[PDB]
Design a protein around this ligand. Structure first.
Ligand SMILES: *[C@@H]1O[C@H](CO)[C@@H](O[C@@H]2O[C@H](CO)[C@@H](O[C@@H]3O[C@H](CO)[C@@H](O)[C@H](O)[C@@H]3O)[C@H](O)[C@H]2NC(C)=O)[C@H](O)[C@H]1NC(C)=O
Ligand SMILES: *[C@@H]1O[C@H](CO)[C@@H](O[C@@H]2O[C@H](CO)[C@@H](O[C@@H]3O[C@H](CO)[C@@H](O)[C@H](O)[C@@H]3O)[C@H](O)[C@H]2NC(C)=O)[C@H](O)[C@H]1NC(C)=O
Ligand SMILES: *[C@@H]1O[C@H](CO)[C@@H](O[C@@H]2O[C@H](CO)[C@@H](O[C@@H]3O[C@H](CO)[C@@H](O)[C@H](O)[C@@H]3O)[C@H](O)[C@H]2NC(C)=O)[C@H](O)[C@H]1NC(C)=O
Ligand SMILES: *[C@@H]1O[C@H](CO)[C@@H](O[C@@H]2O[C@H](CO)[C@@H](O)[C@H](O)[C@H]2NC(C)=O)[C@H](O)[C@H]1NC(C)=O
Ligand SMILES: *[C@@H]1O[C@H](CO)[C@@H](O[C@@H]2O[C@H](CO)[C@@H](O)[C@H](O)[C@H]2NC(C)=O)[C@H](O)[C@H]1NC(C)=O
Ligand SMILES: *[C@@H]1O[C@H](CO)[C@@H](O[C@@H]2O[C@H](CO)[C@@H](O)[C@H](O)[C@H]2NC(C)=O)[C@H](O)[C@H]1NC(C)=O
Ligand SMILES: *[C@@H]1O[C@H](CO)[C@@H](O[C@@H]2O[C@H](CO)[C@@H](O)[C@H](O)[C@H]2NC(C)=O)[C@H](O)[C@H]1NC(C)=O
Ligand SMILES: *[C@@H]1O[C@H](CO)[C@@H](O[C@@H]2O[C@H](CO)[C@@H](O)[C@H](O)[C@H]2NC(C)=O)[C@H](O)[C@H]1NC(C)=O
Ligand SMILES: *[C@@H]1O[C@H](CO)[C@@H](O[C@@H]2O[C@H](CO)[C@@H](O)[C@H](O)[C@H]2NC(C)=O)[C@H](O)[C@H]1NC(C)=O
Ligand SMILES: *[C@@H]1O[C@H](CO)[C@@H](O)[C@H](O)[C@H]1NC(C)=O
Ligand SMILES: *[C@@H]1O[C@H](CO)[C@@H](O)[C@H](O)[C@H]1NC(C)=O
Ligand SMILES: *[C@@H]1O[C@H](CO)[C@@H](O)[C@H](O)[C@H]1NC(C)=O
Ligand SMILES: *[C@@H]1O[C@H](CO)[C@@H](O)[C@H](O)[C@H]1NC(C)=O
Ligand SMILES: *[C@@H]1O[C@H](CO)[C@@H](O)[C@H](O)[C@H]1NC(C)=O
Ligand SMILES: *[C@@H]1O[C@H](CO)[C@@H](O)[C@H](O)[C@H]1NC(C)=O
Ligand SMILES: *[C@@H]1O[C@H](CO)[C@@H](O)[C@H](O)[C@H]1NC(C)=O
Ligand SMILES: *[C@@H]1O[C@H](CO)[C@@H](O)[C@H](O)[C@H]1NC(C)=O
Ligand SMILES: *[C@@H]1O[C@H](CO)[C@@H](O)[C@H](O)[C@H]1NC(C)=O
Lengths: 317, 317, 317
């Protein structure tokens, strides 16, 4: 009579197709997806400190456009710039805009310390109807539009030492008036010149008078520049007109801070990984949601799906 | 008596040596090469639309050097620049030449639309004996050399709105005459100034008078600049002399177009992959022909040969 | 009675833990480390030709700061810049400093050939008390500070052809004096202008008069520029004041030369691979000593240890 003893393995009714080195379609008992392909559609506000820029670019929060006053001295891990953002102050450009945005985003703070420059022989606090703060002609909060006093603009030659233990970031500008009349009306002479220097750097700018296409009726422009002053170094601002002066300095830190362009809403939840589409889970090693990421994120790949086998070959019958 | 039954495998007289993880030389029955190591020596004219630059660089076809007139309004997938190319018009330089070449190559068209600027109070259509078109002093086809009329050069302040649905690329320049005599002879005053602006950009250039080493007897130079004008934006050209003006705009597209330096002839054949050496087959995943490629190409590697085993270990006797 | 024959394998009392695809800790009989994690703490002077910069940056050895006179005409495979380096000549900056440093480091030579420019109508060999050579006011060895002769500075317009078979690298500058008095005291007129050109390039610089913060009592600055002249091309130096002129050219080679910042001492020993920490052995394929390397080096990785099994699984008892 005897007996029979059969050795065997399980199978399932609902197997999953995976790829191998030798077969592009083979059925296994179970698999798990390694490419995260979805976001929750919102940026979770923990654990990273998120600053929603709302109507303001980071640079407009830096300069101090009036709609951005609530951003003064704020800090962030990630600044979120919205596509609806708009400027509503004096028209300006920034040569190497991208670099200024980057270095400020990376620093993660708009901490600003006022300094007294002793501007002697000029009118301070120039305003404009293109920059309205509380129904009143105004200007960039962190900039000081210096004009003539008594049809005189004497040569400024001003020193600000850095006696602190941290670096200072000075933001300043140069006014390019629309016509020759304006050049005289504000600075009482035809040729501006600005030199901003330290021991190790010098930035000399000549204004360029003329019409640019009008933005809120203004054919003139301000061009923005920046200067970092190390401890033991000295800012030296030598100018004879057309200086849009600093009111102080920004702290410049190094850390983990950045900036991202997104229109996703901010939600009350926890997620380590942020993309412009929203936060994504980070269990999986890869993702195809967005090449732009911040935090502990799966690596971006161009595959919609990669299934890792977690069981044997499925052999029904 | 009984029988014998032997199990076995084939072998071949002409095996091939491959590399493995454990052995750098092992013989298998057959292998296939994964590194493409040869080109046909010519650039196949299908499936990619090839434009042979012949004696012309892309920038000379853009500006409109007289030998390049046949390139007006042409389109390409790949522009091929030959090493025999030479310029034969007024000497010029392009600050950030590489970027202009790149953006035009990438756009893939020299489609040009003429516009009427209404230059009032200046002579248009200045010519030079260094730029000969049909045995006649001439100039860049797409540029307009403006000089004085009646020893007067009044301040130009000219607007061209972009009311189209596509971007416009303006190419223009600044004449740097050789001596002070020339500055007066052409512009009837000593100091040129050019400002070209949009709502968002401004490019201000001062000419610089003096001798550069002569090229076809010319110690003067033109410097070339470009300006992109978006829909709803406005070009504004404010100048008091030394303007080499645009006659219109180039369409600027985005697509799959590029440029390549090669001396390989163009042939009538089909090949997806182009290198400077010529077209290469793209069956193999890798190639060692050239790091420069266009199209569906094997990836460049620093290996002359990589043989993939396609059979068992070859064990003769 | 019969016999027993047992098949088996060795084991050791002192096994080593390795990682596999399926197990992060498994014991094998032996392993070898693939990440080099230590340096000898000194830069071996063979087989690479090492030039210890000591108190001198490469740029100070180029210009010819007096403490760097021993570097004249030296060659290197690797120039080593020390953190104690300091400048002790006239204060200067170099726009795109990084690029000048790179191209000279890569060239691997300070071979300098004097040329006669025939400076006619100017005083040559201007000196300064900020640049002391042998207890005597002096200047950069490779630069020629041209000032007025008899309160006249006539317009220089000087040509130097390259009739050699190699490229020439010209280094030159522009003096930015501290005040308007100085501008007259040295150049006997208010407006300098410098144009340096070749057939294919032009560099026009305007000086900018004013105070920068003093360095060894000097509020003025020299700005350094460079020009490469190919065979058959011509240097043309057109200037009306404020030219810090070249005394000749540097040979510019291409080869395997570079530069490294390190404070490690130089030792008498042989090692193919150099890092800022010192030379490292290059038997192993990887290293975690430094991302900065020169020579035949293991590849930098972010792992402290990677043990490759060199024996079977160790199964004691
Ligand atoms: C150089 O030319 C430009 C272009 O014409 C001049 O700027 C233009 O000035 C006019 C006159 O004020 C502006 O027109 C006005 O527009 C407003 C806005 O809707 C409207 O309310 C008025 O009825 C009038 O049409 C126009 O905006 C402006 N154009 C641009 C592109 O900025 C400029 O004045 C000239 N330069 C000098 C120094 O005059
Ligand atoms: C600044 O100096 C330069 C260099 O000497 C002057 O340019 C030179 O001008 C001469 C005189 O016309 C040119 O010489 C001629 O060359 C042709 C070409 O083969 C030949 O047919 C003539 O017999 C004569 O030798 C020379 O080409 C030219 N050199 C360079 C490098 O461009 C320049 O004129 C001076 N600046 C001013 C404003 O005068
Ligand atoms: C523009 O303003 C600056 C800043 O005040 C002026 O430069 C400064 O000039 C003074 C006077 O010589 C220097 O002070 C001296 O310092 C030395 C060094 O220890 C000391 O021995 C003297 O007793 C005296 O205190 C000062 O160094 C210098 N400051 C800087 C930052 O460079 C400059 O002179 C003004 N511009 C013009 C054209 O005058
Ligand atoms: C198929 O395999 C996956 C991965 O092994 C299983 O998913 C895990 O399930 C456990 C429950 O025991 C969870 O705690 C884990 O979070 C899951 N891991 C992952 C990576 O998702 C899944 O349960 C398996 N399915 C079956 C039917 O056994
Ligand atoms: C996440 O956002 C990206 C970027 O917006 C989305 O990818 C874009 O999708 C649009 C329209 O669907 C395409 O026209 C673009 O070409 C895509 N951009 C890129 C860079 O590929 C993406 O679909 C979003 N993903 C998820 C899961 O929401
Ligand atoms: C050695 O192996 C290669 C690859 O398997 C064979 O080359 C293929 O041959 C077929 C003919 O049946 C062609 O249609 C394919 O285009 C070839 N493939 C490649 C990648 O070249 C080759 O024939 C084999 N040699 C022998 C003797 O069997
Ligand atoms: C394809 O073209 C390249 C570039 O011309 C060739 O590689 C060069 O060959 C020359 C002389 O034979 C060498 O001096 C260069 O160093 C090579 N350049 C590079 C970048 O490596 C290459 O041999 C050609 N290949 C084929 C198959 O024709
Ligand atoms: C453990 O394995 C390593 C690598 O196989 C052995 O190290 C080698 O030892 C030989 C001596 O026969 C030396 O010549 C080599 O330079 C060593 N190679 C490396 C990469 O270090 C080691 O000896 C083995 N240990 C034992 C006990 O067998
Ligand atoms: C080799 O040198 C590097 C660079 O100096 C050392 O790494 C730095 O160590 C300091 C202090 O120990 C840290 O503050 C830095 O963050 C490190 N720099 C980087 C870029 O990581 C390194 O320890 C040295 N390695 C050895 C083996 O000596
Ligand atoms: C942003 O700007 C829009 C349009 O001007 C305005 O209606 C809205 O209230 C602003 N929102 C914030 C948060 O400032
Ligand atoms: C200018 O404005 C600043 C900042 O608000 C203020 O402290 C100061 O009173 C004003 N100064 C002058 C000179 O009007
Ligand atoms: C500041 O520079 C201007 C011109 O750049 C000059 O007139 C003035 O003397 C300088 N400052 C002083 C007070 O020296
Ligand atoms: C290109 O230039 C050469 C030399 O000037 C000339 O002989 C040739 O005909 C030109 N070829 C074309 C296609 O324009
Ligand atoms: C200048 O040349 C253009 C383009 O060929 C032509 O349309 C026009 O007739 C000329 N204009 C003047 C003012 O001579
Ligand atoms: C154009 O600019 C010049 C100087 O830049 C100026 O004289 C002129 O007024 C400007 N155009 C007009 C007509 O306003
Ligand atoms: C380098 O400079 C220091 C400090 O001035 C000096 O004491 C030392 O002798 C110098 N060393 C060399 C090698 O020039
Ligand atoms: C200037 O110095 C150079 C280099 O030391 C020397 O050859 C020459 O004699 C001097 N020239 C004049 C004009 O004083
Ligand atoms: C050199 O340039 C200056 C102004 O840039 C000019 O006055 C002079 O004529 C030029 N050289 C000569 C001798 O032509």
């Amino acid at each position: 009579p005897g007996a029979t003893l059969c050795l065997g393995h399980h199978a399932v009714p609902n197997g999953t197709i995976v790829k191998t080195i030798t077969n592009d379609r083979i059925e296994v008992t179970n698999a798990t997806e390694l490419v995260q392909n979805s976001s929750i559609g919102e940026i979770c506000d923990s654990p990273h400190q998120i600053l929603d820029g709302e109507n303001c670019t980071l640079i407009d929060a830096l300069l101090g456009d009036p709609q951005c006053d609530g951003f003064q001295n704020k800090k962030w891990d990630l600044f979120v710039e919205r596509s609806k953002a708009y400027s509503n102050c004096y028209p300006y450009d920034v040569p190497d805009y991208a670099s200024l945005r980057s270095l400020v985003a990376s620093s993660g703070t708009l901490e600003f310390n006022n300094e007294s420059f002793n501007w002697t022989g000029v009118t301070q606090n120039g305003t404009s109807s293109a920059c309205i703060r509380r129904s009143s002609s105004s200007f960039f909060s962190r900039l000081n539009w210096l004009t003539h006093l008594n049809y005189k603009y004497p040569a400024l030659n001003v020193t600000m030492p850095n006696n602190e233990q941290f670096d200072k970031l000075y933001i300043w500008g140069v006014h390019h008036p629309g016509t020759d009349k304006d050049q005289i009306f504000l600075y009482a002479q035809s040729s501006g010149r600005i030199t901003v220097s330290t021991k190790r750097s010098q930035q000399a700018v000549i204004p360029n008078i003329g019409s640019r296409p009008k933005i809120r009726d203004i054919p003139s422009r301000i061009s923005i520049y920046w200067t970092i002053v190390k401890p033991g170094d000295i800012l030296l601002i030598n100018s004879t007109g057309n200086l849009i002066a600093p009111r102080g300095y920004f702290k410049i830190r190094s850390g983990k801070s950045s900036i991202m362009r997104s229109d996703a809403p901010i939600g009350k939840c926890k997620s380590e990984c942020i993309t412009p589409n929203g936060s994504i889970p980070n269990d999986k090693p890869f993702q195809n949601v967005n090449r732009i990421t911040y935090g502990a994120c799966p690596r971006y790949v161009k595959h919609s799906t990669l299934k890792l086998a977690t069981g044997m070959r499925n052999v029904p019958e």
